[PDB]
Amino acid sequence: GELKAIAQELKAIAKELKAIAWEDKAIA
Amino acid sequence: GELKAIAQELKAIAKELKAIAWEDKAIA
Amino acid sequence: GELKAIAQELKAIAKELKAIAWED
Amino acid sequence: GELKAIAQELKAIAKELKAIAWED
Ligand SMILES: [N+]
Ligand SMILES: [N+]
Ligand SMILES: [N+]
Ligand SMILES: [N+]
C-alpha cells in the first residue's frame, strides 16, 4: 500500500542521511 | 549529531505511518 | 547538492501525505 | 488531520536539511 511504500522510502532516506553524516566526519 | 537525529526522526515517522496504515485497514 | 535533493523528496512526500489524508 | 501534521513535519525537516547543506 501507499503509506507502507512511503514508510520504506523514509527509512531509506534515514540510512542515506546517516551515510552522509558519516562521510562528512571521516573527511573532517 | 543533527543528521543522526533527523534520521531517527524519519525512522520514527515511518513507524507512525505504518501504524496509521494498519489502523485504517482494521477499520475498513 | 545531495541534501537539497533529499529535501525536495521530503517535500514531495509531504504533498503525497496530504493527498492520502483527503481520499475516501 | 494527523497526516497533514506529519506532512508539516517533513517540510520542516526539508528546511533543516537545506540549512545543513550550506553550513561550513
Ligand atoms: N531516496
Ligand atoms: N513524529
Ligand atoms: N513517494
Ligand atoms: N527536526
DSSP A1-28: -HHHHHHHHHHHHHHHHHHHHHHHHHH-
Q: List, in order, residues 6 or more apart from D24 with CB less than 8 Å away.
A: none
Name the phi and psi angles at B3, rounded to 5: -60, -45
Q: List, in order, residues 6 or more apart from B27 with CB less than 8 Å away.
A: none
Contact B28, D10 (CB under 8 A): no
Q: Is D23 exposed, middle or buried (0-12, 13-18, 19+ CB in 10 A)?
A: exposed
Q: List, in order, residues 6 or more apart from B26 with CB less than 8 Å away.
A: none
Residue C13: CB within 6 Å of ligand 1? no
- The Cα-based distances of D17 to A12, A21, C13 in angstroms read 16, 12, 15
Burial A17-27 (b: 16+ CB within 10 A, else e): bbebbeeeeee
Instruction: State the method.
Output: X-ray
Which has the closest alpha carbon to B16: A16, A6, C13, C5? A6
| Structural domains in chain A (count) | 1
Q: List, in order, residues 6 or more apart from A1 with CB less than 8 Å away.
A: B21
CB of D14 less than 8 A from some CB of B: no
Contact A9, B23 (CB under 8 A): no
The resolution, in angstroms to one decimal, equals: 1.2
Site residues for ligand 3, CB cut-off 6 Å: A 6, 9; C 13, 16
Contact C17, A6 (CB under 8 A): yes
Domain with A8, as residue range(s), is 1-28
Cell 512511503 found at: A6
